[PDB]
Amino acid sequence: QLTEEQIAEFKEAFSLFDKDGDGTITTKELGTVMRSLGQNPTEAELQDMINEVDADGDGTIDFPEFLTMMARKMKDTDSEEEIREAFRVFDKDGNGYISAAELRHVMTNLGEKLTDEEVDEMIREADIDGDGQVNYEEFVQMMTAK
Ligand SMILES: [Ca+2]
Ligand SMILES: [Ca+2]
Ligand SMILES: [Ca+2]
Ligand SMILES: [Tb+3]
């Protein structure tokens, strides 16, 4: 069921959530990444999210706890319903077009440090008209063909 390739992609996320890297994920660290994802969860909401895999009585999300969680949540290529939700994250201008500048802003905020050329490569990957901007149609385009 769980392949090595999937585990490697999950471990990357765990390393992003852990700010000090103590092995567990508190509500503070959990809400830091969720904030840059266009979401705004409260203290009470962040607590319930942790309880999903918390059954040892620690109130945090350890390494094996997150791995199991990301396995049942991250399904790689999601449906169109979730695709629209993530599309509005990279497009903070709400115009429907995601340029290089916009994309690089969200990437750096997420914690992924990249250069300008790296962003231009991701943009042209989903771009069908080669205009530097990626709309909703082009967003799904990269989910069906790289
Ligand atoms: Ca940590
Ligand atoms: Ca925009
Ligand atoms: Ca376009
Ligand atoms: Tb725990």
Interatomic CA distance for residues 119 and 104, integer angstroms? 6
Locate breaks in the chain with C to N over 2.5 A; list the residue preceding each. none
Interatomic CA distance for residues 28 and 37, integer angstroms? 15
Closest ligand relative to 97 C-alpha: 2
Ligand 3 being an ion, which residues bring their Cβ within 5 A of it? 129, 131
For residue 137, how far is its CA from the centre of ligand 2 (angstroms)?
A: 15
* Residue 126 tokens, joined: 């989903």
Interatomic CA distance for residues 72 and 2, integer angstroms? 10
Closest ligand relative to 14 C-alpha: 1
Q: Scanning the structure block, which residue is given the tokens 């497009």? A: 91
Domain layout of the chain by residue ranges: 1-146
For residue 59, how far is its CA from the centre of ligand 3 (angstroms)?
A: 45
For residue 29, how far is its CA from the centre of ligand 4 (angstroms)?
A: 14
For residue 42, how far is its CA from the centre of ligand 1 (angstroms)?
A: 19
CB atoms within 10 A of CB 104: 20
- The CATH class of 1-146 is mainly alpha
Return the closest-CA partner of residue 33 out of 53, 4, 54, 12: 12
* Residue 62 tokens, joined: 């350890």
Residues near 34 by Cβ (< 8 Å), separated by ≥ 6? 40, 41, 46
Q: How far is CA 137 from CA 69, 90, 92, 142, in A?
A: 30, 14, 17, 9
For residue 3, how far is its CA from the centre of ligand 4 (angstroms)?
A: 23
Interatomic CA distance for residues 141 and 122, integer angstroms? 12
* Residue 56 tokens, joined: 């040892």
CB atoms within 10 A of CB 101: 11
- Contact criterion met (CB below 8 Å) for 91 and 139: no
Size (the chain), residues? 146
Interatomic CA distance for residues 17 and 21, integer angstroms? 8
- Contact criterion met (CB below 8 Å) for 54 and 61: yes
